[PDB]
Design a protein around this ligand. Structure first.
Ligand SMILES: Nc1ncnc2c1ncn2[C@@H]1O[C@H](COP(=O)(O)OP(=O)(O)OP(O)(O)=S)[C@@H](O)[C@H]1O
Ligand SMILES: Nc1ncnc2c1ncn2[C@@H]1O[C@H](COP(=O)(O)OP(=O)(O)OP(O)(O)=S)[C@@H](O)[C@H]1O
Ligand SMILES: Nc1ncnc2c1ncn2[C@@H]1O[C@H](COP(=O)(O)OP(=O)(O)OP(O)(O)=S)[C@@H](O)[C@H]1O
Ligand SMILES: [Mg+2]
Ligand SMILES: [Mg+2]
Ligand SMILES: [Mg+2]
Lengths: 442, 440, 441, 59, 58
DNA sequence: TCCAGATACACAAAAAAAAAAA
């Protein structure tokens, strides 16, 4: 059988070395003298490496002269073969890939050789017992695997990591940026715990029906759009853009939502609406997608298109993740939810922007004495919680207990945070404006 | 090419088993039906096992009767061959040597087969790179010698228990013992119960999200590094290394973690950080790995390299075992979990170093009225429960009930222990310092 | 198509009959005259049966004489064939297996014959209807079952049961044992009201926490181990073997538990401990297991292994049944406890040894005016009280009433006995030594 | 083979038809029997039958 | 079908961000015994040569 | 592999009773 090898890869490596000299540093750290297969190729590579290490400039003429000095010019095919190799070079940009291919082929060939060597033993014990045969397998495989080393995926001593951490904390002494390092939510208490909405993270807001989930997410997105510079993308798979716009106008302009919807407004309400209209038309930092049944690929494509068009994004909202469709798994729901969650996390990591994805809760919450949500109430949510960087629930006590002393107030439960504290935050809820607010009072 | 085999040993063992049956128990633990080379011998051994396990007496007549019940006498060679096996056997006093030699020959043949498999697997990679092939080769070679683990988990007689009790009483009589033998955990009650993290054991720390698994593991690792001489190896598969160093500085200097993260510090905090850094650079006995999705083979290789370079290890931490990937079992999860647990146990036995493998619990735990974990709530609980030596759980009631009067207190539950008592321990939890301390 | 038979099996049967005559009673109840297949084999078997029934010794000479009498020497292959019949027999220890193989061959041959007869009759109704054919088939297939004469399980007539019961009663009557017919418990009153721990029974000892439950169980185990011969098996799901061993040493050597735990002893205590250790090492008839959360199959397998190693058991103890786990029924506790109790009862029946399983009590006992426990107080325990054979509760009046004039005395109330009277006994308690004793005065 | 998915599909189809035709749609529904076990007999949103989507999709 | 396979190879190479050229695609197709179906290296070379520019690739 | 409907045993226990404390 033909051993695995790529002569074209070796020719490309030689051509790239001849044509380009500034990239020798990267090539020198990936290939050796014994990695090449063809003997004339080995001689040519040895000569080129010797010339390059000698410090002399590399060119076809000097390479031919050096080969003639050792009388190996005719052995490697002559000057014509070298000229053909130089002419057949595709480009010098991808010499690293060629070197990696050559190294991989050498590794697999040596592994096959070691396998044949161990296989030969056993057909001729030569006095060795089973224990000796077992022992002289691990040593050979470890020898053939030790040549490759992870870079830099290796254990590190405390000195380097401690020095890097000291450097990090020394530069962070200046410019505190008032605590928040990501996207300002607008609520001081939640800013203290979450330290803003960090990028490359997945944030999940979940609650029972009619709790204030879409309102909370829209408030966060509106504050981000008002403060930040890059646009904020919203995927409204539940409601049309008209209703979201009416809610935003009611929230910003301090105008009753019902009067806006029914068209019963006085002069002051119109003045407030005109002011917020002027502000919104001056900003131009909001995008709404009202399409239904979007697949993860479509969401990714549209997000990438917007990001490339405007150079970046600030925040992405999905409402909600259970309404997305994966046609390849229409016969299974749990796997579909897992794929949706993994795709959302991958998109968040790729675009380096936070993604606020909403979710629903199971009906087991209301069949218990205590109605406070937990992490198990999310529907089909092994993956929903496994790959979530922050889970925030919404709980209003006045819904279940009409006589509760916490009327006109809501609690945000941080059920999970990888690098932050957890707890509860109390916020004032004003439904007629579709707005949350800081708790000025007790 | 003649593969390694020996018909004489098979004939002798078959004749001996036919001749005498009181020796079946001694031989049944050394050979298996698939070890025999030729097919008729495998059929004969299968029939012998079926007859003997049923309790019926085994002779030539009943064996020939059994083989006829499935139309198999012709394939073996008829009653004549069995009669020849019964007659030509001189004796059966040295049957165990034949069992050992046939097992050795079968092992050699299996190793030859695995070598041929790896050799042929490299000519048609089918989209696989060199690292995957090397990992598969290492796994195949290692799985051959790993199967020699059995004959355990049985009730003890009176003599062993009495000797252990007398040794314990004598050790209690002796004062210079300090109550611990292995790695001191730094906590009072935990040392009283577990007697330290004993060597060559697998420890499983399991808790719900946001409970204090990483904090507890890091505290144990810091205590081991401060006390022991040989270094401590940490496999961080989820967190960056800088965050781990920040947590360690906060825990050792009693400085708020948020202050370090944000950069608002005073003079006392800087002095404490300087002293802690001085101590840490004086010790220099910790190693942190931040790779993601490590295979068991890579973990084993890195651990062995570190041990050879430094001459020994004291503690190994994995965070966590649910992230490790087995390339050959990407289509099954329970088998992958079993393989990971077995590999960790084998590494712990080989290096004589305890391994702290964190785990996560199923979501059905939160549906019950009582939120405290049990041994049956583990994710893929079977293999992990079977292969573990010390299972600990972390429970904080303030996470579920904010109004609970147990603020600033965590409960450690010892769900399993082979050589010790089970129970519960309460510890003081200080979140801002990411530290577990003793409870008054 | 060759009919199902094996000439080697019948040849071995007749050879074993000729060689040995001391096991004829062990083989005459299986094979019959017509159950053989080969005609010469049937003839020689009939001759052997005729010789044996006459009481005459059986050997080659007698067989040859009988064959000459019936002039069947040529019909049986000659005297050389007769010698070969008794020559190719390895051993006579497995004659019953050969006999049952021959019987099975005869049965399957008869079944094939009946099936062929039914098939032949089907194609030739001879003026019969489908119902008649079905009835004929039912009768033919039922005749084979009726003529079985040997079937495992199933209903049995009253004569055999009566004979076995009378034999058991006579055997018990011929052996004087002073009213004890089981395993000695160590207490006179308990033995009088229980006749020891009978086999194939599930015994439950239950009490409130910190009442002397484990102490009573270990006292029974120590007494049984000292008295009996076959080993005792203990499953400790709460304490390791070390604590149990320390308690046993303290009880048998009359040494304070606190002194043993703290390591402070004296010369007399050391001498007593050495003597107890020597006696226990001389006996060596106990086993302790500490694995937690044992499934019923695991304990069954371990008990089977120990019994096979030592050729029997004397007592199996579990402490306690409420810690065992059944993975398949984790969604309901009541069904899990029912399965645990059923498995314990099945193990007791199979190994023919008494099983003792400990259990707890509900907190509802405290609410009621009377603190004396009853059957219903056991925890999730429908099958616990519906499957046990003897239930005993440990009651200490001093715990609830410090002014009671019965300090240091624990009363055992027999809450249930399926085949005996119910009642209560009084025993003294020794906390400083952790040992129950008989009450006097 | 699955009643919950069938009810979810029915509710989704009704909502889609209402959105398409631009017309109010009244979908009468039943209630579960868990209401009868409570001292307060006033219905709640969670008492609808096989009704994840019924209460998560209605306006 | 050969175009389908070569497009699958191109998608696999470019989705990870690694550079794509004749050598990389040829070595990727050869690793799975699929270079013979598409016509060998000659067809890939002809395809690379026959394209003047990508001005209207969209 | 989750969601939803329904029969039955058990845990107390929960309050209420309520006795009785006042
Ligand atoms: N004018 C108003 N006055 C008082 N409350 C109002 C008014 N308008 C809306 N609300 C309430 O505001 C809340 C808005 O709920 P949302 O958060 O928008 O919906 P949701 O939480 O996403 O739940 P879904 O999507 O319907 S399952 C509801 O509880 C309404 O009853
Ligand atoms: N920076 C911090 N400031 C304050 N409290 C913190 C901080 N980080 C963690 N905590 C708290 O300390 C607890 C310790 O949990 P950790 O062990 O750090 O995380 P965890 O148990 O690994 O959660 P996972 O990784 O999602 S399973 C957290 O649950 C928080 O309550
Ligand atoms: N030194 C001692 N002096 C006096 N009483 C003691 C001493 N040591 C133990 N005891 C008591 O002896 C009794 C025997 O304990 P146990 O029989 O184990 O009660 P138990 O709680 O039912 O055990 P379980 O069911 O296995 S948890 C307990 O009530 C102890 O309080
Ligand atoms: Mg909504
Ligand atoms: Mg963690
Ligand atoms: Mg006990």
């Amino acid at each position: 059988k033909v051993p695995p090898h790529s002569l074209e890869a070796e020719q490309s490596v030689i051509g790239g070395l001849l044509l380009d000299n500034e990239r020798w540093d990267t090539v020198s750290e990936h290939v050796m003298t014994q990695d090449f297969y063809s003997r004339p190729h080995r001689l040519i590579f040895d000569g080129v490496k010797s010339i390059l290490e000698a410090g002399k400039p590399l060119d076809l003429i000097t390479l031919s002269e050096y080969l003639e000095q050792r009388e190996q010019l005719e052995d490697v095919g002559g000057f014509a073969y070298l000229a053909d190799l130089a002419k057949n070079t595709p480009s010098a940009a991808n010499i690293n890939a060629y070197a990696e291919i050559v190294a991989e082929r050498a590794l697999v060939r040596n592994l096959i050789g070691v396998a044949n060597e161990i296989a030969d033993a056993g057909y001729d014990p030569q006095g060795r017992n089973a224990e000796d045969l077992l022992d002289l397998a691990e040593s050979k495989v470890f020898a053939i695997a030790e040549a490759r080393t992870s870079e830099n995926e290796g254990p590190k001593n405390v000195d380097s990591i401690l020095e890097r951490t000291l450097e990090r904390i020394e530069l962070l002494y200046k410019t505190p940026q008032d605590g928040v390092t990501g996207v300002n939510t607008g609520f001081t208490d939640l800013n203290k715990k979450t330290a803003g909405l960090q990028g490359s993270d997945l944030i999940i807001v979940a609650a029972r029906p009619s709790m204030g989930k879409t309102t909370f997410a829209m408030n966060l997105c509106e504050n981000a759009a008002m403060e930040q510079d890059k646009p904020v993308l919203i995927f409204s798979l539940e409601m049309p853009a008209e209703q979201i716009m009416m809610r935003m106008l009611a929230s910003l302009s301090r105008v009753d939502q019902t009067k806006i919807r029914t068209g019963q407004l006085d002069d002051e309400d119109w003045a407030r609406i005109s002011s917020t209209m002027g502000i919104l038309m001056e900003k131009k930092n909001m995008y709404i997608d009202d399409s239904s049944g979007l697949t993860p690929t479509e969401v990714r494509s549209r997000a990438r298109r917007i990001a490339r068009e405007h150079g970046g994004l600030s925040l992405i909202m999905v409402d909600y993740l259970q309404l997305m469709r994966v046609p390849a798994l229409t016969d299974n729901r749990t796997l579909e939810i897992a794929e949706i969650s993994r795709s959302l996390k991958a998109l968040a990591k790729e675009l380096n922007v936070p993604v606020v994805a909403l979710s629903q809760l199971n009906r087991s919450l209301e069949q218990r004495a205590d109605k406070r949500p937990v992490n198990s109430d999310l529907r089909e949510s092994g993956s929903i919680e496994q790959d979530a960087d922050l889970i925030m629930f919404i709980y209003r006590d006045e819904v279940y207990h009409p006589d509760s002393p916490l009327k006109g107030t809501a609690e945000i439960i941080i059920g999970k945070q990888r690098n932050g504290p957890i707890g509860s935050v109390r916020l004032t809820f004003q439904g007629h404006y579709s707005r949350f607010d800081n708790y000025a009072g007790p």
